[PDB]
Amino acid sequence: KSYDYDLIIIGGGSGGLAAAKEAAQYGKKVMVLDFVTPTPLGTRWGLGGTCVNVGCIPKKLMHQAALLGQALQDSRNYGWKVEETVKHDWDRMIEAVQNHIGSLNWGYRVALREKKVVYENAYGQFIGPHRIKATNNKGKEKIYSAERFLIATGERPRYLGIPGDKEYCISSDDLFSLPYCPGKTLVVGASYVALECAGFLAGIGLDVTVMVRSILLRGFDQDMANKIGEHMEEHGIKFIRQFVPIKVEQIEAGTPGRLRVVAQSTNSEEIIEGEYNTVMLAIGRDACTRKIGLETVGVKINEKTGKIPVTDEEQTNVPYIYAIGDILEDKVELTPVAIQAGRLLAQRLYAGSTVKCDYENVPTTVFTPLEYGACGLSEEKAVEKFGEENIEVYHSYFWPLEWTIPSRDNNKCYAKIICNTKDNERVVGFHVLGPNAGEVTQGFAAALKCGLTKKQLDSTIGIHPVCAEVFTTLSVTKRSGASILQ
Amino acid sequence: SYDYDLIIIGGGSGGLAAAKEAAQYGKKVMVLDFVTPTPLGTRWGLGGTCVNVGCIPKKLMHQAALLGQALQDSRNYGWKVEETVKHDWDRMIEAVQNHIGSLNWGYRVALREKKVVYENAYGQFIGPHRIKATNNKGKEKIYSAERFLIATGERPRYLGIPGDKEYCISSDDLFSLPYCPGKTLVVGASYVALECAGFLAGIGLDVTVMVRSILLRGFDQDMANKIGEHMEEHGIKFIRQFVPIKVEQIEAGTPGRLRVVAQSTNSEEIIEGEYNTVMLAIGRDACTRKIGLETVGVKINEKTGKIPVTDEEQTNVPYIYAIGDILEDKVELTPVAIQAGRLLAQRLYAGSTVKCDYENVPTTVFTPLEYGACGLSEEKAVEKFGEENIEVYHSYFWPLEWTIPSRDNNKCYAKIICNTKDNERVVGFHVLGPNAGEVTQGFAAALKCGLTKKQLDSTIGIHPVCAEVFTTLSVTKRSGASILQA
Numbered sequence: 004k005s006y007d008y009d010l011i012i013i014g015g016g017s018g019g020l021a022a023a024k025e026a027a028q029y030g031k032k033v034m035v036l037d038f039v040t041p042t043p044l045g046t047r048w049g050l051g052g053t054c055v056n057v058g059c060i061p062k063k064l065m066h067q068a069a070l071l072g073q074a075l076q077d078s079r080n081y082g083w084k085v086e087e088t089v090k091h092d093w094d095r096m097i098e099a100v101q102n103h104i105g106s107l108n109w110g111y112r113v114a115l116r117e118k119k120v121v122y123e124n125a126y127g128q129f130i131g132p133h134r135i136k137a138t139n140n141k142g143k144e145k146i147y148s149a150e151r152f153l154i155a156t157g158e159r160p161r162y163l164g165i166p167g168d169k170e171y172c173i174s175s176d177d178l179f180s181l182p183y184c185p186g187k188t189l190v191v192g193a194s195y196v197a198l199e200c201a202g203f204l205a206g207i208g209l210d211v212t213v214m215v216r217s218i219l220l221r222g223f224d225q226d227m228a229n230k231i232g233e234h235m236e237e238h239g240i241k242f243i244r245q246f247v248p249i250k251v252e253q254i255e256a257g258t259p260g261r262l263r264v265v266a267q268s269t270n271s272e273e274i275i276e277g278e279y280n281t282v283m284l285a286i287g288r289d290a291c292t293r294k295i296g297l298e299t300v301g302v303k304i305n306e307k308t309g310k311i312p313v314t315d316e317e318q319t320n321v322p323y324i325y326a327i328g329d330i331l332e333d334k335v336e337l338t339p340v341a342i343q344a345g346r347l348l349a350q351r352l353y354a355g356s357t358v359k360c361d362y363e364n365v366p367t368t369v370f371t372p373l374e375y376g377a378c379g380l381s382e383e384k385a386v387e388k389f390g391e392e393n394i395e396v397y398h399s400y401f402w403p404l405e406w407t408i409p410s411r412d413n414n415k416c417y418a419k420i421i422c423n424t425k426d427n428e429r430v431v432g433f434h435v436l437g438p439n440a441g442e443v444t445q446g447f448a449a450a451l452k453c454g455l456t457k458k459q460l461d462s463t464i465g466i467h468p469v470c471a472e473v474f475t476t477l478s479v480t481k482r483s484g485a486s487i488l489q
Numbered sequence: 490s491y492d493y494d495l496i497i498i499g500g501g502s503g504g505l506a507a508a509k510e511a512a513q514y515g516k517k518v519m520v521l522d523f524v525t526p527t528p529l530g531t532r533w534g535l536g537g538t539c540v541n542v543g544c545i546p547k548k549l550m551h552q553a554a555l556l557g558q559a560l561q562d563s564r565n566y567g568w569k570v571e572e573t574v575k576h577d578w579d580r581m582i583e584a585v586q587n588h589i590g591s592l593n594w595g596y597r598v599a600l601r602e603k604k605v606v607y608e609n610a611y612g613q614f615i616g617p618h619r620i621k622a623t624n625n626k627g628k629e630k631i632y633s634a635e636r637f638l639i640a641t642g643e644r645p646r647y648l649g650i651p652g653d654k655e656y657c658i659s660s661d662d663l664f665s666l667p668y669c670p671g672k673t674l675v676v677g678a679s680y681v682a683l684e685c686a687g688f689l690a691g692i693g694l695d696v697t698v699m700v701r702s703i704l705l706r707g708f709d710q711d712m713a714n715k716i717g718e719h720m721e722e723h724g725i726k727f728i729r730q731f732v733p734i735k736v737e738q739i740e741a742g743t744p745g746r747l748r749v750v751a752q753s754t755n756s757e758e759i760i761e762g763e764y765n766t767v768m769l770a771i772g773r774d775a776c777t778r779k780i781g782l783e784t785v786g787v788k789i790n791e792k793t794g795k796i797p798v799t800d801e802e803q804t805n806v807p808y809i810y811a812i813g814d815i816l817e818d819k820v821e822l823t824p825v826a827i828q829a830g831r832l833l834a835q836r837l838y839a840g841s842t843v844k845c846d847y848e849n850v851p852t853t854v855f856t857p858l859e860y861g862a863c864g865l866s867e868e869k870a871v872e873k874f875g876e877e878n879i880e881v882y883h884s885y886f887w888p889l890e891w892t893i894p895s896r897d898n899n900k901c902y903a904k905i906i907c908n909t910k911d912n913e914r915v916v917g918f919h920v921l922g923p924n925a926g927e928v929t930q931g932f933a934a935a936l937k938c939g940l941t942k943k944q945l946d947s948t949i950g951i952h953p954v955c956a957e958v959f960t961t962l963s964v965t966k967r968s969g970a971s972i973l974q975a
């Protein structure tokens with residue numbers, strides 16, 4: 004065994020870098036490859052991956068801006084001398100956000116440089132067994148070999164295929180660094196990315212509209228999804244139901260130009276047009292598994308979804324090649340899990356760890372104007388598994404004390420758990436719509452990993468006055484009809 | 490036979506919870522709540538200590554300090570909000586109060602709706618099953634009940650020095666001061682002392698804290714010190730090992746001018762200085778003395794004032810029970826008072842065999858940098874399982890939100906305590922950071938489930954949320970590895 008690297012990692016994102024750092028921690032000579040292919044409009048960025056640059060970080064930060072705005076309103080009723088002269092500066096904001104992104108890029112680049120991990124800013128490509136072609140930025144190609152390979156390329160934003168979409172529209176990739184303020188914009192899609200973005204754009208004071216093909220947050224508990232939508236609507240975000248863009252024309256040009264979106268319902272022959280300054284398409288992402296020469300090494304992938312089938316140890320059909328993160332099939336497209344898989348994989352390969360990555364009950368939270376945290380089965384899925392008559396739902400509204408003197412949004416925040424009667428009222432589903440949803444959810448996710456039961460939950464004393472406490476004493480069920488409108 | 494099935498003395502957190510519950514079972518119940526005036530005349534409405542002069546007003550004002558800080562942040566996120574904004578003490582108070590007012594009344598409607606008699610009179614035992622109810626204007630009345638529940642809670646304790654009752658204020662007076670405290674001195678180092686000093690400071694005032702010995706006695710001292718350091722780092726001045734010997738009125742007025750003179754606990758040193766207000770946050774004394782416990786023969790720890798009770802909150806006298814703060818060797822917290830109250834009722838009038846679990850009751854101090862905790866402290870962990878059997882995995886974290894406002898890095902801290910002799914059981918949870926309570930709640934449930942370090946690691950964290958830091962704790966204090974490089 005005398006290859007170039009002990010392990011070559013393709014992709015320097017959440018998983019890639021986590022894997023790289025672990026392995027290195029054990030001496031294994033590792034090399035990471037990372038290359039960012041520009042968006043149809045020319046956007047590109049530094050080391051880090053989706054989240055670090057065009058995902059979570061920028062997303063959460065801007066969501067904080069919208070939140071801070073709302074705080075400026077609350078400060079008044081608390082005795083702070085602030086007016087409504089609260090006007091936003093999109094550039095000044097983006098300027099801060101991007102600058103922070105700069106730092107992360109350099110931080111990440113330095114963690115490796117100091118961990119004895121080689122970093123090459125080149126596009127990887129398998130050419131043959133244990134062999135990979137590394138095309139650099141200026142076309143210069145180079146060839147490396149390694150005992151093992153880790154595929155962690157992640158995904159990129161998808162398109163509609165309609166006319167003008169790639170020429171006049173923007174994706175999550177372009178959004179977080181737009182040189183100009185989006186202005187009145189339309190958001191096509193209803194995934195968390197779609198809603199999160201629409202929400203903070205709106206929260207930042209813009210005119211936002213959301214075009215929905217079918218339902219909201221397909222995949223999550225629909226009851227929650229609707230409440231999230233209602234809050235958004237109740238606040239100004241406009242929704243267009245069951246429609247999809249068919250064309251996009253540049254009525255006028257200029258930083259935020261004038262776009263002429265045309266679209267048509269599904270169920271009907273109806274067709275409508277509208278105008279906007281920006282059009283952000285948030286209709287999902289496609290794995291970057293096609294153009295990497297998986298053939299030259301013989302790695303099977305779900306030719307349809309682009310996803311890579313993998314053993315419960317993140318191993319592909321090819322024994323020396325593994326896959327981690329979003330590109331994986333029937334797993335969970337989340338940054339924290341990508342890092343676990345990455346780090347545990349390394350531990351198993353170079354430390355005799357027999358620990359496997361647990362993709363069950365992975366907690367999650369959507370950062371819409373009204374944050375939604377969750378962990379475990381959704382309501383519909385809970386019945387679809389244990390039988391409608393074996394699960395009881397305990398729900399209740401709650402009021403963030405921080406909201407009483409500002410005097411707003413009562414009976415809006417909602418919480419609910421899902422228990423399986425045939426198993427000691429096991430808490431199999433956890434949902435909360437309210438401020439700091441994530442902070443509230445984390446701990447409970449740990450509780451589920453411990454088999455939290457309704458009895459144990461009740462026996463836990465809540466903390467006063469903290470939102471979360473609403474979860475320690477819930478007795479009104481859905482199968483009792485009891486009205487919880489207080 | 491008797492006038493009532495159950496007469497409850499004290500209409501606070503426990504009292505009302507007990508009343509409302511017990512009533513739910515067609516029991517003829519009555520609540521007696523009387524607020525004896527403060528040394529300076531301050532009084533308030535139904536609800537107990539938490540509603541009027543406790544949690545609620547405390548948390549709310551703490552939110553005012555927070556909102557102020559947010560006004561600062563907004564600027565770096567693209568909000569045109571001039572640095573330096575004035576705060577209105579009077580405005581804020583008027584708002585808090587109105588909220589408490591709304592509450593007082595609310596609870597009033599709660600009891601009556603559930604057919605619970607409420608009498609605004611001071612209760613007093615006069616003989617077996619007999620109680621004297623002295624009303625506001627001296628008119629006394631006498632009632633009898635099959636059972637009695639003592640839930641009188643406590644009240645602020647004074648030093649005993651000259652001028653303390655005539656020129657100083659307590660938590661009781663603070664939340665409704667008709668004038669802005671101005672430069673003030675806070676005597677004490679309990680959570681009440683620190684919380685108040687903190688928000689007063691956060692509201693823009695000159696605050697000083699006089700400490701007799703250590704900070705937050707009873708709490709993990711490592712945490713306590715970090716909390717103090719943050720406070721000091723922000724302007725709150727501390728005077729170590731000194732106790733007020735006497736306070737004199739240099740002047741009078743709304744914001745008055747008092748002189749304080751205190752002496753060392755170490756040496757003979759004696760010191761003094763001008764202060765507009767002087768708050769004495771040095772603990773509370775149970776209201777168990779002046780209620781005629783003799784006439785019915787209920788034994789109490791004559792020294793502490795607390796009331797010894799069985800594991801069902803039953804006193805030595807079979808028809809008399811006690812709940813809440815006045816209890817001995819338990820936890821003085823609103824949420825527990827309500828559990829004891831609600832479960833006691835369920836046991837007495839619903840055949841419930843469930844007992845109140847005072848073990849691992851989660852808690853969180855609302856200092857400028859919130860501190861949440863649950864379980865054994867570090868020092869106590871060793872004092873129980875032996876220093877070599879406990880692991881301390883810790884780490885600093887920096888809330889995403891402080892990245893662009895670029896402030897307070899390497900300040901937020903988290904740590905768990907595991908017992909090696911028991912699968913690295915998580916026996917102690919601590920977190921210093923924003924929204925400490927929201928983060929802690931869930932974990933407290935996890936402990937009730939026996940959370941183990943292995944289970945914790947197997948839990949996937951939510952990104953980018955503060956709480957997540959706990960899902961990957963790897964650096965232990967013993968493996969004396971610096972973590973102060975974040």
Ligand SMILES: Cc1cc2nc3c(=O)[nH]c(=O)nc-3n(C[C@H](O)[C@H](O)[C@H](O)COP(=O)(O)OP(=O)(O)OC[C@H]3O[C@@H](n4cnc5c(N)ncnc54)[C@H](O)[C@@H]3O)c2cc1C
Pocket residue numbers: 013014015016017018019036037038039040051052053054055057058059060062125126127128155156157158159175196291295327328329330336337338339341951952953
């Ligand atoms: C708008 C948005 C918001 C999100 N918000 C959250 C959130 O709040 N929380 C959360 O947990 N997750 C969030 N995610 C998802 C998160 O970003 C992904 O789960 C995570 O990045 C996946 O890890 P990965 O390792 O697969 O890397 P990326 O997905 O980090 O993939 C690796 C990188 O390598 C590049 N690459 C691909 N092929 C090659 C090659 N051949 N050579 C070199 N480089 C290559 C990729 O284009 C990319 O830059 C969000 C995603 C988006 C789009």
Ligand SMILES: Cc1cc2nc3c(=O)[nH]c(=O)nc-3n(C[C@H](O)[C@H](O)[C@H](O)COP(=O)(O)OP(=O)(O)OC[C@H]3O[C@@H](n4cnc5c(N)ncnc54)[C@H](O)[C@@H]3O)c2cc1C
Pocket residue numbers: 467468498499500501502503504521522523524525536537538539540542543544547610611612613640641642643660681776779780812813814815821822823824826
């Ligand atoms: C500054 C401060 C901050 C606090 N912050 C928090 C916090 O964040 N979270 C938390 O959980 N707890 C907090 N607490 C404590 C919490 O409020 C108490 O633990 C809780 O109120 C105790 O419950 P209780 O039932 O004993 O009622 P109170 O202690 O609510 O007692 C009930 C009532 O009975 C009255 N009474 C007394 N004697 C008689 C009599 N003879 N006849 C009739 N009525 C009588 C009292 O005056 C009072 O109105 C705080 C306390 C203080 C002082």
Ligand SMILES: NC(=O)c1ccc[n+]([C@@H]2O[C@H](COP(=O)([O-])OP(=O)(O)OC[C@@H]3O[C@@H](n4cnc5c(N)ncnc54)[C@H](OP(=O)(O)O)[C@@H]3O)[C@@H](O)[C@H]2O)c1
Pocket residue numbers: 161162163191192193194195197215216217218219221222247285286287288289308310333
């Ligand atoms: N769907 C699930 O149950 C589920 C659960 C967990 C993980 N996943 C992962 O998510 C993948 C699905 O693709 P994805 O990640 O790119 O997106 P996504 O997160 O599944 O879905 C985003 C949503 O995309 C919209 N959308 C997709 N194509 C569209 C189009 N052509 N026009 C308009 N709207 C469109 C959806 O419309 P609709 O309202 O019509 O859906 C909806 O708004 C799966 O293959 C899997 O890897 C799916």
Ligand SMILES: NC(=O)c1ccc[n+]([C@@H]2O[C@H](COP(=O)([O-])OP(=O)(O)OC[C@@H]3O[C@@H](n4cnc5c(N)ncnc54)[C@H](OP(=O)(O)O)[C@@H]3O)[C@@H](O)[C@H]2O)c1
Pocket residue numbers: 648676677678679680682701702703704705706732770771772773774793818819821
């Ligand atoms: N030793 C005890 O205090 C004690 C004994 C038995 C039971 N308990 C339990 O603890 C609960 C809380 O006790 P608590 O209400 O007395 O106060 P506390 O909340 O325990 O403590 C407040 C803190 O009070 C300070 N303090 C107390 N007396 C003071 C004085 N004369 N001058 C200056 N500072 C003073 C303490 O200093 P120091 O840190 O120097 O004390 C410290 O700042 C009780 O209700 C009971 O359940 C406490």
